[PDB]
Amino acid sequence: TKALISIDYTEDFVADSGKLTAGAPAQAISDAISKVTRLAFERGDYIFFTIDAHEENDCFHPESKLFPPHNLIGTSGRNLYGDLGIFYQEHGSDSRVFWMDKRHYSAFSGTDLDIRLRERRVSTVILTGVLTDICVLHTAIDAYNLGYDIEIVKPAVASIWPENHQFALGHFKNTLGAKLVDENLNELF
Amino acid sequence: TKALISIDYTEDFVADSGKLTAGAPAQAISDAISKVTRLAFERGDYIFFTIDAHEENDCFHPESKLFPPHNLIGTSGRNLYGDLGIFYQEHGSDSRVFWMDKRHYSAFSGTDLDIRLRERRVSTVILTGVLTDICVLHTAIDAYNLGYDIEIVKPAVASIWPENHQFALGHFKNTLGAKLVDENLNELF
Amino acid sequence: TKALISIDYTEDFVADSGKLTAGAPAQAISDAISKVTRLAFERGDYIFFTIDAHEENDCFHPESKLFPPHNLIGTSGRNLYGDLGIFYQEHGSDSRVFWMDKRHYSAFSGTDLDIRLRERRVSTVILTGVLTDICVLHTAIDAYNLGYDIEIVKPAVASIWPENHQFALGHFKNTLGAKLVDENLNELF
Amino acid sequence: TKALISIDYTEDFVADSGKLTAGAPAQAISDAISKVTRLAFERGDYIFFTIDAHEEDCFHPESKLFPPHNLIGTSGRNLYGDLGIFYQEHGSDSRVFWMDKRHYSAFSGTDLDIRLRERRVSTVILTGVLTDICVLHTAIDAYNLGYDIEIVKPAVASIWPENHQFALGHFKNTLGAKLVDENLNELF
Ligand SMILES: [Zn+2]
Ligand SMILES: [Zn+2]
Ligand SMILES: [Zn+2]
Numbered sequence: 001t002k003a004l005i006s007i008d009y010t011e012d013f014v015a016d017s018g019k020l021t022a023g024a025p026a027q028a029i030s031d032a033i034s035k036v037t038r039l040a041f042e043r044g045d046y047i048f049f050t051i052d053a054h055e056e057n058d059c060f061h062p063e064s065k066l067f068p069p070h071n072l073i074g075t076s077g078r079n080l081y082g083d084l085g086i087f088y089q090e091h092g093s094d095s096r097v098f099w100m101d102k103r104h105y106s107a108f109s110g111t112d113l114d115i116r117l118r119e120r121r122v123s124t125v126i127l128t129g130v131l132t133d134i135c136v137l138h139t140a141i142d143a144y145n146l147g148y149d150i151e152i153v154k155p156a157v158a159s160i161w162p163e164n165h166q167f168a169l170g171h172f173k174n175t176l177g178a179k180l181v182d183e184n185l186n187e188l189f
Numbered sequence: 190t191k192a193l194i195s196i197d198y199t200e201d202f203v204a205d206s207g208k209l210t211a212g213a214p215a216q217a218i219s220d221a222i223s224k225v226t227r228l229a230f231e232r233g234d235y236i237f238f239t240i241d242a243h244e245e246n247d248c249f250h251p252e253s254k255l256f257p258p259h260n261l262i263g264t265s266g267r268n269l270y271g272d273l274g275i276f277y278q279e280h281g282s283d284s285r286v287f288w289m290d291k292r293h294y295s296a297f298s299g300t301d302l303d304i305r306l307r308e309r310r311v312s313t314v315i316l317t318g319v320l321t322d323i324c325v326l327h328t329a330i331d332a333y334n335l336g337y338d339i340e341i342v343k344p345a346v347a348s349i350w351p352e353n354h355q356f357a358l359g360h361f362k363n364t365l366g367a368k369l370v371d372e373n374l375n376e377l378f
Numbered sequence: 379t380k381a382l383i384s385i386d387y388t389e390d391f392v393a394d395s396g397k398l399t400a401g402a403p404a405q406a407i408s409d410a411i412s413k414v415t416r417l418a419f420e421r422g423d424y425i426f427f428t429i430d431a432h433e434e435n436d437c438f439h440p441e442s443k444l445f446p447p448h449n450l451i452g453t454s455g456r457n458l459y460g461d462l463g464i465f466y467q468e469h470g471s472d473s474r475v476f477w478m479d480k481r482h483y484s485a486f487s488g489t490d491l492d493i494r495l496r497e498r499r500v501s502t503v504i505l506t507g508v509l510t511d512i513c514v515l516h517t518a519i520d521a522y523n524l525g526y527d528i529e530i531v532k533p534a535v536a537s538i539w540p541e542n543h544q545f546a547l548g549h550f551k552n553t554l555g556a557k558l559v560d561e562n563l564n565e566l567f
Numbered sequence: 568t569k570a571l572i573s574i575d576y577t578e579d580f581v582a583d584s585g586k587l588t589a590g591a592p593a594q595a596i597s598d599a600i601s602k603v604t605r606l607a608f609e610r611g612d613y614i615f616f617t618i619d620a621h622e623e624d625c626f627h628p629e630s631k632l633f634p635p636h637n638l639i640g641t642s643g644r645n646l647y648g649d650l651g652i653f654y655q656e657h658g659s660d661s662r663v664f665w666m667d668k669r670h671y672s673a674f675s676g677t678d679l680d681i682r683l684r685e686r687r688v689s690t691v692i693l694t695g696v697l698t699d700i701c702v703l704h705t706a707i708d709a710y711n712l713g714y715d716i717e718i719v720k721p722a723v724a725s726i727w728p729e730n731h732q733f734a735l736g737h738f739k740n741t742l743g744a745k746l747v748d749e750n751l752n753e754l755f
């Protein structure tokens with residue numbers, strides 16, 4: 001332990017011209033998300049970038065009927081936003097940094113995330129990224145059911161809707177027993 | 190083929206003197222939940238009662254630190270509330286009706302629910318019970334990841350928090366692509 | 379730390395009049411299996427009895443077409459054989475000893491075994507019971523995929539087919555990287 | 568309506584110069600494995616190539632049990648024989664998949680179950696190597712996930728004849744699998 005999970009913080013989710021952008025609140029966490037990721041890496045944590053990898057005209061994916069095309073394979077939409085992308089440029093080849101393609105909201109679903117964590121005997125996951133109430137929430141619930149201790153970096157998660165953001169934070173703390181931390185990985189009270 | 194999942198509609202979650210009761214809003218759905226369950230049964234659907242089964246002094250359960258003791262094995266707290274309980278006494282021994290003990294919020298986690306459904310080639314699960322934003326939500330997300338079509342019986346789910354109930358219904362429809370239905374199993378628009 | 383898994387060592391699998399008995403070879407391990415289980419318990423290990431729980435006229439179970447009825451719920455066939463049964467009568471109520479019903483061959487499939495092990499941060503499982511090439515093999519493979527270290531108690535596993543017993547032992551050592559141990563929990567070289 | 572799973576039929580497992588080759592018995596199924604895959608595809612079945620993707624990784628417990636094999640970006644991962652030609656022709660088809668795997672089972676840490684569930688597939692047809700290792704593990708996972716199982720007997724192989732026979736017997740008698748030939752006809 002520990003492992004930091006970086007969820008869908010890409011151009012399509014964050015940039016103003018993004019295909020499924022969260023806009024201003026997503027852009028606002030850029031400094032915090034890059035700071036906390038660098039900090040975790042510096043102290044010896046494993047870093048998992050778990051990124052949507054969709055195909056256009058995938059009729060068998062139930063998500064294709066719910067949202068417009070986003071994070072399409074081979075497009076600039078899948079590029080990491082801001083200084084987080086710079087971090088991946090510098091340290092993406094490191095043995096402790098991973099890139100994982102995902103098709104569901106949860107970073108665990110149909111991936112080998114659990115396997116890689118169990119290989120390294122990680123007991124605690126630290127969650128960052130977007131959206132708080134969709135891919136972060138699904139990931140947190142999967143992590144809970146798989147018996148991981150959970151930390152949520154409050155200033156490094158965001159949603160389009162403030163009320164959905166608040167529901168999710170409340171769910172993490174009160175139902176999942178997750179620890180809410182700041183960008184310095186210190187517990188928030 | 191379809192299965193109705195009846196989540197935690199017991200004394201401890203519903204009755205006034207219940208140890209972890211949702212109170213009035215949970216009691217309010219008693220007529221709707223019993224009606225829809227009898228209807229699904231009449232239509233030849235499978236019925237799964239997925240019920241919290243906790244032990245006193247379970248130090249290894251993360252839930253024991255978050256909530257007071259509830260649905261303890263061998264106590265009246267685990268008895269089904271209202272006409273739903275009467276239905277179980279009348280039809281519990283039918284080959285299409287199941288009682289399933291669970292320890293996490295999701296009906297799938299550490300149970301053989303997925304196995305029983307796949308044996309019967311079920312492609313659609315119909316969700317009822319409490320709480321909308323906790324055991325129903327977790328069950329719905331697990332169902333989504335496992336590739337089931339989902340129906341939510343809107344008048345047969347309840348939470349102690351109205352805002353959380355609203356978040357969850359929105360999440361089911363917009364994120365999971367679930368169908369919202371009434372107590373007559375007719376789609377709501 | 380460690381968990382010992384006791385697989386299907388019941389009257390139906392072991393006794394002369396057992397409905398699906400492995401007969402003499404299964405009876406031959408009675409001393410070793412009871413000894414190793416008592417030893418593991420004395421060393422502070424967790425003990426999981428993972429026992430077939432079948433229903434008669436379960437037409438949805440693929441196993442019902444392959445084998446005659448066995449380990450039927452509520453029958454004497456599910457009673458633990460030999461001194462193992464005495465151990466359970468003596469220590470079944472200890473917080474470290476578990477009884478788990480299962481429907482597939484693997485002790486993990488449709489059960490909460492993985493959950494209970496993760497709760498206790500168990501990294502290694504010790505396998506005992508019958509049959510070596512069926513419920514032991516399936517359980518070992520599931521354990522491997524879930525990232526557990528595996529120990530096999532060679533004198534405390536048995537099959538009705540000696541060639542199959544040999545295949546399984548070889549598979550455990552060479553393919554799964556399991557440690558073969560004796561009834562004193564000492565590694566065999 | 569069904570899905571054929573093509574397990575690890577690559578240069579490293581099959582060719583004489585292969586890093587973890589099964590040799591002659593693996594080479595012997597080349598004609599049958601290519602024929603049955605083409606037939607399955609022509610019928611409208613989904614085809615999943617599930618292929619070992621290893622890194623020369625200390626956290627992988629398999630690295631202490633076998634020499635390096637099927638390394639990412641190497642020619643050891645190329646499909647052997649006419650099967651490779653089929654992939655050239657139809658690899659970009661929406662019904663044909665290439666899945667990297669790190670465990671023996673094609674299901675473990677992959678999205679195989681998800682893709683099958685999306686397509687409402689109820690039956691998997693297993694081909695490839697080794698009968699008693701990546702085929703056996705895949706079959707056991709399929710069984711636990713509730714799939715009907717077919718095994719193409721002439722399109723599976725192992726290094727050891729006794730292990731091959733154990734596995735075939737296990738599939739038929741324990742998992743309830745149907746044994747079929749290269750024409751996808753049941754064997755009796
Ligand atoms: Zn997406
Ligand atoms: Zn509970
Ligand atoms: Zn059995």
Ligand SMILES: [Zn+2]
Nearest residue numbers: 619621629636
């Ligand atoms: Zn390999």
